[PDB]
Design a protein around this ligand. Sequence first.
Ligand SMILES: [Zn+2]
Ligand SMILES: [Zn+2]
Lengths: 66, 50, 258, 115, 149
Amino acid sequence: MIIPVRCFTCGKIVGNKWEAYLGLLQAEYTEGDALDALGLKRYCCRRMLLAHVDLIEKLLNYAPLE
Amino acid sequence: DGLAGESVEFQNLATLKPSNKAFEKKFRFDYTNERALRRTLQEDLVKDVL
Amino acid sequence: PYANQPTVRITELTDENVKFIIENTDLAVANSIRRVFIAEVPIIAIDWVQIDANSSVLHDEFIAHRLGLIPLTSDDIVDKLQYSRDCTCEEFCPECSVEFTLDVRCNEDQTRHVTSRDLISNSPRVIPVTSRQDDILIVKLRKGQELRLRAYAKKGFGKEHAKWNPTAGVAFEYDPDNALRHTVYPKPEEWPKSEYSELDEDESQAPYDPNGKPERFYYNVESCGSLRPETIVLSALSGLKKKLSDLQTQLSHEIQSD
Amino acid sequence: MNAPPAFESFLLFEGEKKITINKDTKVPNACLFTINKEDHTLGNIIKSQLLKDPQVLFAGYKVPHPLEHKIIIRVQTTPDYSPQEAFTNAITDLISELSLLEERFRVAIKDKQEG
Amino acid sequence: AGILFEDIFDVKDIDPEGKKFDRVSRLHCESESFKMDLILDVNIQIYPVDLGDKFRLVIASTLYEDGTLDDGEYNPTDDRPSRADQFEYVMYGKVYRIEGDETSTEAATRLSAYVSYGGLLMRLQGDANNLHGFEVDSRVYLLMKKLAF
Ligand SMILES: [Zn+2]
Ligand SMILES: [Zn+2]
């Protein structure tokens, strides 16, 4: 739903990389070259950002007010 | 037979199926061969059976 | 019958990881340090969250959980605080805790990224890792939703909860060429070379070395931000040495009292 | 709901002893140390340190159940050496070695940093 | 003493049927003086033997020269001078069988003591005089050592 704070396996903070990683993919980087420009080497940490599906963007569409 | 099943096992009957000569030279106990009995029995038993 | 004289050699030291080599030690001592890096090294982490208003789309416990996993720079504090269960106080103290505070309301039209910039601490030195690179997203609020809470950070180690685990990943390794044949390859050439392999590209594994023990344990300790990667080590050595001294005191009491 | 609280792996209850020596009766000169609220971190360094003692004839450790936080260390020595002092000397020098490893790691840091 | 046997052998065939294990290989030695067979399994990894090697193989009943007949437990801290100090491969086993060419009347001429060294078998198939101190179920040592001639 929202990017986990840490990689489940490793312990490494991946919570601050979802916006940076969606911005690099918007730029032109391929998805494997975005993941190490962010500094994610182990493939344990790399599936946090590849596999993440962001649902909170859909849950924010249901405004309580306005 | 009057026995419970937790204690019986699988054995083999030795006297079924050898043949009428292999049965004899295996279950017979000759007491005549003096040399062979000093191999099996001690000296003071080989006179008692001989 | 006695001790061994280990020697250390740092090969790489950055502010995110240390690679060192320890020589002349037993495999048990070298692996037990590895476990002390992961569990028993104290660190500060949010552990008490009182939620005053939460109207985000996330839970109440989803916020508190994501707040415990935010790493806070413990570096000289963490050795001055006390454990919460040992403070002779009632309801947290500046001497056993650090108080945080998040107050966010989305009033604008765009969505709000509640990040860890919003967690305001009361000590200037225990802050989330923002000092000198984005910030750990906590929620995203919409127009009219909010979050006020106050939270408390106390001292602990990774044996209670993983949130108090100071490392990203510890890379222990010994004997890169299969010299001891501690592992037995069915086809030794399908195996890539270690990073540390003092072997040519011709041969596959080192020839078997019958009388020989492990030494030269290669480590690569990587921090998560909370402690500096050479303070994780200096603290695991002291934390282990202190488990042992305590065991020895309790032992001498058991011996003299029998 | 039947989950044990996580501080139960390191916090000693009220009445529990840290360590507890029991003379073993099957063989002469053998004891069993039972450490509470410990695991393979402390049990493995002591055993490997005791196997360096030449006067120690047996050393081992077990963890009887992993859901329970207790190890047993069985030491047997030669008749001129009690296992009470084998276990003590296995800690004294394990401490001396960890303290020396700390001094050396510290000077190697301050030489790596600008050096 | 306690030397149940003593001889010089030389490896005549190493694992012949193919290598079944990886640290253990069958040596099919033959003797030199008493003209005995041997089928031995050695730890080919910590004591490697190649073909045409010659070794002196002393099967002993004890290790201490005075023949004081130890118990069968392992105690490394021991001062007493042993026979293992002049050999390179010592094993410790248990003779598990003694086959022979007995007939029903006259005695046997060729014996075969099969001893088993913790799992690693051996068969000393010779003639019935050198195989005398061997009786089934008795503890025995191996003591071999390669001759560099
Ligand atoms: Zn990871
Ligand atoms: Zn307090």
